[PDB]
Amino acid sequence: EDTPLVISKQKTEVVCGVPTQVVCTAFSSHILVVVTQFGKMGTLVSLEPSSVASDVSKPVLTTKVLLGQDEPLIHVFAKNLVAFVSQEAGNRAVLLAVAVKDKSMEGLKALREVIRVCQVW
Amino acid sequence: EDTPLVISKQKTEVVCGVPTQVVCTAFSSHILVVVTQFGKMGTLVSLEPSSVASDVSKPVLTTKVLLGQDEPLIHVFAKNLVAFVSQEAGNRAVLLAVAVKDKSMEGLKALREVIRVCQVW
Ligand SMILES: [K+]
Ligand SMILES: [K+]
């Protein structure tokens, strides 16, 4: 027997032909989101609500690549993949591990649907 | 129903009076180890096998604090907590999320025992 201290949910789903496992875990000040294809951990991105820029209505979601190649697309993709998680979880920081080599709008929408199935906030 | 793509195991155990959840997940090039108390994600540390120093028998396990306060004890503690994971998993990198405020040798040994219960390598 076991009783978790934090809520986690996972789901394996095919996304644009690729089996993909999603895991979401709710910590008090972070949601950890894992999106893994082909057994790989991929790129680790922190998404931190930060000081407003021109729009004072909502925090800026600042991205940092912590592990893996720091290249510009993954920052933008990560924001579109999990900004909704941060927002819905009370403007909480998100730690994302993302291993998705072949990206598209169709795939992005499908990944967000799996993350929604794994909602823990 | 569901079928994971990566092996994960978790356990909640009391360690020196504190309920602690451990999760280990095996990716092809990383073991992700979560050690959480009080619902917190804590400090994120990467432990990367790296170029030898004076002892040529084994890689150096280089630590980097990726999220949380970068202070010297957590580097050393992290190495003693999960070096065995890296070694046993084929000198694999480890990504550690560790939220343990009150550290001791007794507690360190007990945490390693929980990580062993959650072996995924
Ligand atoms: K990948
Ligand atoms: K902590």
Characterization of the model:
2 copies of one chain form a homodimer. The first copy, chain A, has 121 residues and is of the alpha+beta class. Chain A has a single domain (1-121), classed as Ribosomal Protein S5, domain 2 (2-Layer Sandwich). Chain A is built from 2 helices and 6 strands; from the N terminus they run E-E-E-E-E-H-E-H. Chain A has a 6-stranded mixed beta sheet. In chain A, a hairpin with a 2-residue loop joins strand 1 (8-15) and strand 2. Chain A is globular. The interface between A and B is medium-sized, with 32 and 32 residues. The complex binds potassium ion (2 copies). Residues 40, 42, 99, 101 of chain B line the site of one potassium ion (K).
> What's the SSE pattern of chain A?
EEEEEHEH
| CATH architecture grouping of chain A | 2-Layer Sandwich
Task: Tell me, briefly, the overall form of chain A.
Answer: globular
The beta-strand count of chain A equals 6
Biggest protein-protein interface?
Answer: A-B, 32 and 32 residues
Domains of chain A (count): 1
Instruction: Provide a count of the helices of chain A.
Output: 2
| Structural classification of chain A | alpha+beta
Rg of chain A (CA only): 14 Å
Ligand types? potassium ion
Report strand order across the widest sheet of chain A: 1-2-3-6-4-5
| Major sheet details of chain A | 6 strands, mixed
Please estimate the helix content of chain A: 10-25%
CATH topology of chain A: Ribosomal Protein S5, domain 2
- First-last Cα distance of chain A: 25 Å
What is the CATH domain class of chain A?
Alpha Beta
Strand content of chain A: 35-45%
The multimeric state of the shown protein is homodimer
